[PDB]
């Protein structure tokens, strides 16, 4: 099967938000609204904001999963390459095969779907701190888009779903991701090509 990538705000008005980091050659993570694409360096912090119009019920969670963007590759599970899955860089919670990790959250849970074999990481949906209008999840991508035997230059999408305590869908959003050495230059190049 293939996970749906249809944007759905749902009853709580769920949608993502991204910081405005710019395209300087030294930037480590940058988002392109024009391409709906996040460019980031290997294993660097990717701040993703979660916005809602109303507070979802206690027990609501937020899950992240990667899928290949090209339809001809969509049924293939996105996973770390033969090299990175063996580099012993786990934080003690994320399985070494998982591409997407959540930083600084001891309540993060990593799932290997018994049926689809797909990987995902899910955390409780946190309300904004006093003074804040949204909450942020910090993700890390653990392989380069170019990793041989892994993504192998194929673009991926990250699908973020807001789900209830049973895992039922409450909201969905998504964005393309390119993990590369110079996110700033690549974003500038791709936006120019689009222009
Ligand atoms: Zn890799």
UniProtKB/Swiss-Prot annotation:
Please give the annotated consequence of changing residue 150 to E. In a sporadic cancer; somatic mutation
Outcome (variant: residue 75 to P):
In a sporadic cancer; somatic mutation
**Recorded consequence of changing residue 191 to L:** In a sporadic cancer; somatic mutation; requires 2 nucleotide substitutions
Q: What is the effect of changing residue 33 to S?
A: In sporadic cancers; somatic mutation
Phenotypic consequence of residue 66 to D: In sporadic cancers; somatic mutation
**Free-text domain note:** The N-terminal and C-terminal disordered regions undergo liquid-liquid phase separation (LLPS) following homotetramerization and activation. Post-translational modifications, such as phosphorylation or lactylation affect the ability to undergo LLPS. The nuclear export signal acts as a transcriptional repression domain. The TADI and TADII motifs (residues 17 to 25 and 48 to 56) correspond both to 9aaTAD motifs which are transactivation domains present in a large number of yeast and animal transcription factors.
Record protein name field: Cellular tumor antigen p53
């Amino acid at each position: 099967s293939v996970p749906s990538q249809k944007t759905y705000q749902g009853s709580y008005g769920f949608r993502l938000g991204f910081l405005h980091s710019g395209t300087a050659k030294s930037v480590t993570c940058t988002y392109s609204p024009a391409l709906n694409k996040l460019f980031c360096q290997l294993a660097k912090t990717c701040p993703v904001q979660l916005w809602v119009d109303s507070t979802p019920p206690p027990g609501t969670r937020v899950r992240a999963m990667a899928i290949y963007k090209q339809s001809q590759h969509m049924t293939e599970v996105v996973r770390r390459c033969p090299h990175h899955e063996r580099c012993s860089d786990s934080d003690g919670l994320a399985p070494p095969q998982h591409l997407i990790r959540v930083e600084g959250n001891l309540r993060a849970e990593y799932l290997d779907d018994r049926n689809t074999f797909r990987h995902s990481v899910v955390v409780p949906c946190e309300p904004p701190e006093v003074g804040s209008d949204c909450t942020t999840i910090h993700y890390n991508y653990m392989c380069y888009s170019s990793c041989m035997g892994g993504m192998n230059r194929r673009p991926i999408l990250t699908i973020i779903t807001l789900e209830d305590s049973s895992g039922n869908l409450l909201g969905r959003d998504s964005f393309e991701v390119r993990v590369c050495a110079c996110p700033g230059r690549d974003r500038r190049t791709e936006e120019e090509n689009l222009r």
